[PDB]
Amino acid sequence: DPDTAVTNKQSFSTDVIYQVFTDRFLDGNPSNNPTGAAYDATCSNLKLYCGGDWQGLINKINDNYFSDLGVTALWISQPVENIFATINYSGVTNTAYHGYWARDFKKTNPYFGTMADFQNLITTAHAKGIKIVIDFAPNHTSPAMETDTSFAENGRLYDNGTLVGGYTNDTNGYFHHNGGSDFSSLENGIYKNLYDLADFNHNNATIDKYFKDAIKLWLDMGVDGIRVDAVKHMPLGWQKSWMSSIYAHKPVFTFGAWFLGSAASDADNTDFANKSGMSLLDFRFNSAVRNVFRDNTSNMYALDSMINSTATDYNQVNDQVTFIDNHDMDRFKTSAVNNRRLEQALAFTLTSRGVPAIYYGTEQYLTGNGDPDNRAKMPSFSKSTTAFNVISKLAPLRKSNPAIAYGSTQQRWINNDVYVYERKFGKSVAVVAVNRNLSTSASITGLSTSLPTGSYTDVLGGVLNGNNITSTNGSINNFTLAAGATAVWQYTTAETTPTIGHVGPVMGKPGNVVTIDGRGFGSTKGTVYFGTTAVTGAAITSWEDTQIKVTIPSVAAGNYAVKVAASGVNSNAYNNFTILTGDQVTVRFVVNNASTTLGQNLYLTGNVAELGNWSTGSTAIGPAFNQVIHQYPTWYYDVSVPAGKQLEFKFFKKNGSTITWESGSNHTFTTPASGTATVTVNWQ
Numbered sequence: 001d002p003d004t005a006v007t008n009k010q011s012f013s014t015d016v017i018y019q020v021f022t023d024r025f026l027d028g029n030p031s032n033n034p035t036g037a038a039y040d041a042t043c044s045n046l047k048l049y050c051g052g053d054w055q056g057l058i059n060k061i062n063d064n065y066f067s068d069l070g071v072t073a074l075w076i077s078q079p080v081e082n083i084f085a086t087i088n089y090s091g092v093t094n095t096a097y098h099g100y101w102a103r104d105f106k107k108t109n110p111y112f113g114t115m116a117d118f119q120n121l122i123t124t125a126h127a128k129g130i131k132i133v134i135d136f137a138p139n140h141t142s143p144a145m146e147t148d149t150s151f152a153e154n155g156r157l158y159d160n161g162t163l164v165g166g167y168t169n170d171t172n173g174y175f176h177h178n179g180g181s182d183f184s185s186l187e188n189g190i191y192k193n194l195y196d197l198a199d200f201n202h203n204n205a206t207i208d209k210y211f212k213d214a215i216k217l218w219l220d221m222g223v224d225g226i227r228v229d230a231v232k233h234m235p236l237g238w239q240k241s242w243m244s245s246i247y248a249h250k251p252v253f254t255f256g257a258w259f260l261g262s263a264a265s266d267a268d269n270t271d272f273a274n275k276s277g278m279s280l281l282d283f284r285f286n287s288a289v290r291n292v293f294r295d296n297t298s299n300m301y302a303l304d305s306m307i308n309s310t311a312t313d314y315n316q317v318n319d320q321v322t323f324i325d326n327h328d329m330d331r332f333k334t335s336a337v338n339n340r341r342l343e344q345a346l347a348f349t350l351t352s353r354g355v356p357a358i359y360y361g362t363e364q365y366l367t368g369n370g371d372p373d374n375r376a377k378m379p380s381f382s383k384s385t386t387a388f389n390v391i392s393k394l395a396p397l398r399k400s401n402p403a404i405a406y407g408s409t410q411q412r413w414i415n416n417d418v419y420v421y422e423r424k425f426g427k428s429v430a431v432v433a434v435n436r437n438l439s440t441s442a443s444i445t446g447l448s449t450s451l452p453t454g455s456y457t458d459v460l461g462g463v464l465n466g467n468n469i470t471s472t473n474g475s476i477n478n479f480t481l482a483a484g485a486t487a488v489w490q491y492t493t494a495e496t497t498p499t500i501g502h503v504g505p506v507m508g509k510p511g512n513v514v515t516i517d518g519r520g521f522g523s524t525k526g527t528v529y530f531g532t533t534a535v536t537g538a539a540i541t542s543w544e545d546t547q548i549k550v551t552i553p554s555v556a557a558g559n560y561a562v563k564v565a566a567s568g569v570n571s572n573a574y575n576n577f578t579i580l581t582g583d584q585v586t587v588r589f590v591v592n593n594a595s596t597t598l599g600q601n602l603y604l605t606g607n608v609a610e611l612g613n614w615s616t617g618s619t620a621i622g623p624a625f626n627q628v629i630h631q632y633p634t635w636y637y638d639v640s641v642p643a644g645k646q647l648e649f650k651f652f653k654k655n656g657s658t659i660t661w662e663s664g665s666n667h668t669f670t671t672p673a674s675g676t677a678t679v680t681v682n683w684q
């Protein structure tokens, strides 16, 4: 199967995701519409239901709205059953139209459709070569008040009809009862309620099993990717464990939402993206893009800086999901923001690194500030807008040109208003030039690219006032980049040598199957390398010129680099591939009496790769928590660790560069075969 096909559940780099709020798109079947006060046929009261459902998505796939638009994947609202009650928030009536107020993760939301409608959606999508990604929120259920059970549905959870439990009288501790987060710290936001939403206590084995089971259900229905909600409000440890169970079953591209306010590096966010097993919605990319194109608060240098900075911080930048806007911010379009700028931001995104996502209605220049105003009904299906055009012309390049999907980025020319960058992968190159200035053109001189000698046409056919160029061994002849212009020139050729473009997923236990997408692998089954270990024959389940499916060998757990060797020729190395010890389980380490010095933090390390393998650096677990679940001088941390294994571990305090360990012997604990556990020790 080519890396490009719809069957590629492990990589979304050659795709273009279209994020759509199911209720606001198209009510294909009015027979499932809510009844009474929860419904608004006109769709003027954005807090109520408008009727949009799965049949609507099906319809638009069938009449090629999406196929002509160029999108190759749909990201939909959370498919599960949500609370039926209505909530009056200080005068205003609110409904679960957004899909975020889950009540039963094992059943579908009747308003969107049935199980059948859903399967029918998967089938129709795959038939047109469109992947399906689902929103999934395991952090909570619905809004609930501990004291008043008559508010909404008191956060009650169901296991395919069977009641598991509500927020009040939660004797079993299925939820956290530590008040509501004030967002003052990472820990405060993980173990307290996100507003009035009942927060799941994932340390509870029932809850742990429920979510692994529940996700298997949807994977088994053929979903191709998962968008995890509120990753910054759940423990990294649990999540990683959860992720390894997903990858051991049916690996699918998975990314989360860790909100950020600027393009500035955020340590925790970087750490999550590199250690959790999933990637993230790229908020740094978003900010920089808006500062430059929408708000005029930054110039091209800010944009280039972010490109570099992000590429440096994230292990696999090609896995971050990019966008110009979405449901958590103002629509890109304002009366004060002109069309050409929106169009430029699209073109920029479509050609830049990562996995691009377009919030529905962007092609129709939809406006709307704040929640719920930015989630208005799809206004029209005209295929005539300039923006609709750009998407259809640029999107396909993600599949046809590997420089775009897998390439690096090099700044070729820049100044306050002009930016010219180059995407390159093997012999395939792509050059994009943008002039955000709306009134004045720019004379470009001395531009060099890797474009071979020849004359190149603007891939956009001049619709954004682009021009053609002539290369003489990279040296492009002088030309003028018109006002508000943007052009794409590219060169594609067949790769002759093995060259890896993507590997998915990048975490697993021996025995799993990963996907290696690239070029020049040739059709002769060669050899795969995990560090020094050669993997050949039957262990390589599939081999093609552009994609290899291989099985993780039984080597020591750790960080590896992956190489493909085709016909004695070695390819480039894809770094930071994590090999786990085996199945995972989440364990909460607790240590008492660990008093510290001002600015001194407590960490944890032990005898397995998952605990750092006795390291005191970036591989050590921590810094531990000491406020919500357990107060200082007791510290705690939820860590993903190997199932049924005897572990040796010790805590250690670190301030500046001086390390102080626990004395005595190492602590030992044998982990359960599955589920979760708590182990409490005393600082030595």
Ligand SMILES: OC[C@H]1O[C@@H]2O[C@H]3[C@H](O)[C@@H](O)[C@@H](O[C@H]4[C@H](O)[C@@H](O)[C@@H](O[C@H]5[C@H](O)[C@@H](O)[C@@H](O[C@H]6[C@H](O)[C@@H](O)[C@@H](O[C@H]7[C@H](O)[C@@H](O)[C@@H](O[C@H]8[C@H](O)[C@@H](O)[C@@H](O[C@H]1[C@H](O)[C@H]2O)O[C@@H]8CO)O[C@@H]7CO)O[C@@H]6CO)O[C@@H]5CO)O[C@@H]4CO)O[C@@H]3CO
Residues within 6 Å of the ligand: 089, 094, 098, 100, 143, 183, 194, 195, 196, 197, 229, 230, 232, 257, 259, 327, 328, 371
């Ligand atoms: O059901 C909840 C909610 O779910 C969805 O939203 C999710 C969103 O997609 C995620 O990104 C994330 O939210 C992050 C957010 O995007 C970031 O901006 C940031 O949030 C900060 C705020 O920006 C900042 O303003 C402040 O927040 C304070 C508010 O300003 C203040 O008004 C008040 O909030 C109260 C609301 O006014 C009130 O109406 C009620 O809220 C309900 C909403 O009206 C209703 O639409 C719905 O919201 C959905 C939303 O539509 C989905 O997109 O339900 C809400 C209640 O269930 O109650 C509010 C609280 O009383 O107080 C807040 C806090 O002081 O600070 C925050 C700091 O974080 O980060 C967010 C978290 O990362 O998660 C949400 C939820 O999953």
Ligand SMILES: [Ca+2]
Residues within 6 Å of the ligand: 027, 028, 029, 030, 031, 032, 033, 051, 052, 053, 111
């Ligand atoms: Ca409907």
Ligand SMILES: [Ca+2]
Residues within 6 Å of the ligand: 139, 189, 190, 191, 192, 199, 200, 233, 234
């Ligand atoms: Ca939480």
